[PDB]
Design a protein around this nucleic acid. Structure first.
Ligand SMILES: N[C@@H](Cc1c[nH]c2ccccc12)C(=O)O
Ligand SMILES: N[C@@H](Cc1c[nH]c2ccccc12)C(=O)O
Ligand SMILES: N[C@@H](Cc1c[nH]c2ccccc12)C(=O)O
Ligand SMILES: [Mg+2]
Ligand SMILES: [Mg+2]
Ligand SMILES: [Mg+2]
Length: 787
RNA sequence: UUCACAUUGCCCAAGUCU
RNA sequence: CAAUGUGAA
């Protein structure tokens, strides 16, 4: 329950495809490098201040440092050793003591062996050392954000308004591979505050043209909410905006305007404006400090502008990474060549395989088979594998009568019954109930009435005028209070129906009512399906940036048949920003019990797809969650020990894959085709991992999902696990498309997001309250309410 | 709240000194 | 899932 298994073999399925990856080969010298520890007092100074201190120090004590790199905290590295036995030094800032002592030697050669087959595991300390080398210069030249670097783009202004603009940048990371050390580079963009005078900032915030008396309370509060917490220089952080203008704002030995008239001989041009409190500064003498990322949520218009800047087709992104690398010229970096490192300026060539899609089996009389082409099929001339007969249903229209008329509802109804009959999900008649209502208050009594009145009620269709709190209320009552199936539809999709939208709607409705839309062609499935097997999907979703006390939400779903198609869900609230699923053992236990009730089999194998865990968390997560899965098995039955396969799925990494031949580019966005698999060259030197781009990239540059096997009792071959994973991407019921992650992992997301809706404005006694809020009704417990 | 893909928001990372 | 885009039988 600890060390990840070795790669068993390499995959062989699928035709080959030439690819380019945004990985750049590194040539590392075979020398010892030297690690030193650095203590600085005081030790709360920002990482950038620490970097500053060291670099002025290094160029000070040259002849006592005969080009060291620094990680901004405690670690310093040199290519050739120092004369230095601990030493304590003295430096001066634009009054620091720096402790510099030798701790160890880092051999890059040892890393060379780990990249070879000689060493089983890559020595992390070597990788970190290389990362610090590659990060030293851009950490002082640019503005660091995570593993990325941002700067104002020379020659261009990309304003967002409101005092904000777009900074362009890039992600940078160092990683081992089957081939060589690789520099992973991707381009990015993010919102920064303009380094403008506060006066101009005021005008952009308050939508002023020039500069238009003292400020309205509404003007003062808006400007206060925009600048509070930001840094300004004439270096201060703004904590408040005064209520009084500089004319009258007073401080004990006496106004602000008079102090500046007297001491600095400065007569304020706009004394009618309030002061920033940081002790008060007039707006006129203050600039917004450059390089402050905008943490706050962007406006709708700012988002739109941002999208129209970070939106690039695959070839466009490919070209921009390449142009960045050729302009970056990593090989002229003084610290890089100091350590004898050479970075290749061209993308690494990789050979991928394009896996064949499974056939999708439908039902009805014809029992049609659909063949995915480039990640997409459709349901024309096809019926559900198991279609639901809808006898008793109701409509609740919360949209206004004037806009969503009885004629609209009638026309929507007839169109839906037509599409649903074609799909093999016959809606046998008119609804038994159809009424208008308004506001969240009407939801609960209306649904109780429906439940008490109409025996065998199967569904409530709910018409919503658009974004409204009524939706959350409908799901609260439907999912957790009364246990009733609901399907919501936006008014505009009732007013104007299309075959495609109605058809997609029927996919969800059939599923919600217990139907089977389609199944993988049974004979086309990998050998693992010969024995009872349960597929688990797990995810944790964390609160937005800046949030302080909202819980994280853990969701786990499990397959309930052999197709696999039907899933049951479990969900939990847990500690703020904790990734480890705390109550997993209980969740899996529930799923195993439900599996046995549905199939009358005990799983001989458990396949666990775990979404969103980064490399630095692998061992911690695996340790708790693998043991949790075992615990669930143990407490169920004596010596019940099914084989566990633990797979981490990452969609949000920085690996991009491009077609080498423009002949292979698919569609407008020019992405790699669905099914493209990579398990050589750029993947892990010893462990079992692969990229699988399972979906059609219709938009921008596709994110190829990465799969990392942390544990495998079942000893999968590369081929079977890759094919299995790909096939599970075709089992997602909400669309006739191969999706970007396997359906169980995707369902886990939907469950987590539904719980978040159950918690809107509700997030010991605290925990029990929130836990109760996400607990679904007994009747809902065994349904796909999350669809 | 028809749906997928894409950008960001999510663990690690990053960030915090008159 | 929220904001914003591009798309679909
Ligand atoms: N029903 C199958 C058993 C089976 C195979 N694979 C499964 C996966 C899940 C559940 C059951 C199964 C049989 O007896 O032939
Ligand atoms: N404990 C289950 C039955 C069961 C025993 N061993 C199992 C292994 C897997 C799934 C279910 C089981 C019950 O209460 O009915
Ligand atoms: N099969 C493993 C142990 C194991 C796998 N799955 C389990 C589930 C529960 C308990 C133990 C296990 C072994 O060789 O020992
Ligand atoms: Mg997650
Ligand atoms: Mg942390
Ligand atoms: Mg959206």
């Amino acid at each position: 329950a600890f060390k990840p298994p070795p790669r068993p073999d390499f995959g062989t399925s699928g035709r080959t495809i030439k690819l380019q990856a945004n990985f750049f080969e590194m040539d590392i010298p075979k020398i010892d490098i030297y690690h030193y520890e650095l203590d600085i007092k005081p030790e709360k100074c920002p990482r950038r201040v620490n970097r500053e201190i060291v670099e002025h120090m290094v160029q000070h004590f040259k002849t006592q440092f005969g080009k060291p790199v620094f990680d901004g905290r405690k670690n310093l590295y040199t290519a050739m050793p120092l004369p230095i036995d601990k030493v304590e030094l003295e430096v001066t800032l634009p009054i620091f003591k720096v402790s510099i002592k030798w701790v160890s030697c880092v051999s890059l050669q040892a890393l060379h062996d780990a990249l070879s087959g000689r060493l089983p595991s890559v020595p992390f300390e070597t990788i970190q050392a290389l990362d610090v080398v590659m990060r030293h210069l851009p950490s002082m030249r640019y503005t660091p954000v995570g593993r990325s670097f941002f700067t104002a783009s020379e020659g261009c202004s990309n304003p967002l308004g409101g005092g904000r603009e777009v900074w362009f940048g890039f992600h940078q990371s160092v990683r081992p591979s089957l081939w060589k050390m690789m520099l992973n580079i991707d381009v990015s963009a993010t919102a920064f505050y303009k380094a403008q005078p506060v006066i101009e900032f005021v005008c952009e915030v308050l939508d002023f043209k020039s500069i238009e008396k003292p400020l309205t309370d509404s003007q003062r509060v808006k400007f206060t909410k925009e600048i509070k917490g930001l840094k300004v220089e004439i270096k201060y952080r703004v904590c408040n905006v005064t209520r009084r203008p500089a004319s009258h704002q007073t401080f004990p030995l006496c106004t602000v305007a008079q102090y500046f008239k007297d001491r600095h001989k400065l007569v304020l041009r706009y004394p009618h404006l309030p002061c920033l409190q940081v002790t008060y500064l007039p707006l006129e003498v203050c600039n917004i400090v450059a390089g402050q990322r905008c943490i706050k949520k962007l406006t709708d218009n700012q988002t739109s502008t941002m999208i129209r800047a970070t939106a690039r087709s695959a070839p466009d992104r490919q070209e921009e990474i390449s142009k960045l690398m050729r302009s970056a010229d990593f090989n002229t970096d003084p610290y890089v060549r100091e350590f004898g490192i050479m970075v290749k300026d061209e993308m690494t060539d990789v050979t991928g395989r394009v896996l064949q899609p499974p056939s999708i089996l439908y039902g009805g009389r014809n029992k049609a088979i659909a063949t995915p082409v480039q990640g997409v099929w459709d349901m024309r001339n096809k019926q559900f594998h198991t279609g639901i007969e809808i006898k008793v249903w109701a409509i609740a229209c919360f949209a206004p009568q004037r806009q969503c008329t009885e004629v609209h509802l009638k026309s929507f109804t007839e169109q839906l019954r037509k599409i649903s009959r074609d799909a093999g999900m016959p809606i046998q008649g008119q609804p038994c109930f159809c009424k208008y209502a308004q506001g969240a208050d009407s939801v609960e009594p209306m649904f109780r009435h429906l439940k008490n009145t109409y025996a065998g009620l199967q569904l409530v269709v709910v018409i919503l005028p658009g974004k409204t709190p009524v939706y959350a209320e409908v799901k609260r009552v439907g999912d957790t209070v009364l246990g009733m199936a609901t399907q919501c539809v936006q008014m505009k999709n009732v007013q104007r129906t299309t075959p495609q939208t109605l058809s997609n709607l029927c996919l969800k409705i059939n599923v919600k009512l217990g139907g089977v839309n389609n199944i993988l062609l049974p004979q086309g499935r990998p050998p693992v399906f010969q024995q009872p097997v349960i597929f688990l999907g797990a995810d944790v979703t964390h609160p937005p940036a800046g949030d302080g006390k909202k819980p994280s939400i853990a969701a786990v779903v499990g397959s309930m048949d052999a197709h696999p198609n039907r899933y049951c869900a479990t969900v939990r609230v847990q500690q703020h920003r904790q990734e480890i699923i705390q109550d997993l053992a209980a969740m899996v236990r529930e799923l195993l019990i439900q599996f046995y009730k549905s199939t009358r089999f005990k799983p001989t194998r458990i396949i666990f797809y775990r979404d969103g865990v980064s490399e630095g968390q692998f061992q911690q997560v695996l340790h708790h969650e693998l043991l949790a899965i075992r615990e669930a098995c143990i407490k169920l039955e004596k010596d019940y020990q099914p084989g566990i396969t633990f797979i981490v799925v990452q969609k949000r990494h920085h690996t991009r894959l491009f077609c080498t031949d423009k002949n292979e580019r698919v569609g407008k966005s020019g992405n790699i085709p669905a099914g493209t698999t990579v398990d050589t060259k750029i993947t892990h030197p010893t462990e079992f991992d692969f990229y699988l781009c399972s979906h059609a990239g219709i938009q921008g540059t596709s994110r190829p999902s990465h799969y990392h096997v942390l544990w495998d009792d079942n000893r999968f071959s590369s081929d079977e696990l890759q094919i299995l994973t790909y096939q599970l991407c075709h089992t997602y019921v909400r669309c006739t498309r191969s999706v970007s992650i396997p359906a169980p992992a995707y369902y886990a997301h939907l469950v987590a997001f539904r719980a978040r809706y159950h918690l809107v404005d509700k997030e010991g006694r605290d925990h029990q309250a929130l836990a109760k809020a996400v607990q679904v009704h007994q009747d809902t417990l065994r349904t796909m309410y999350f669809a």
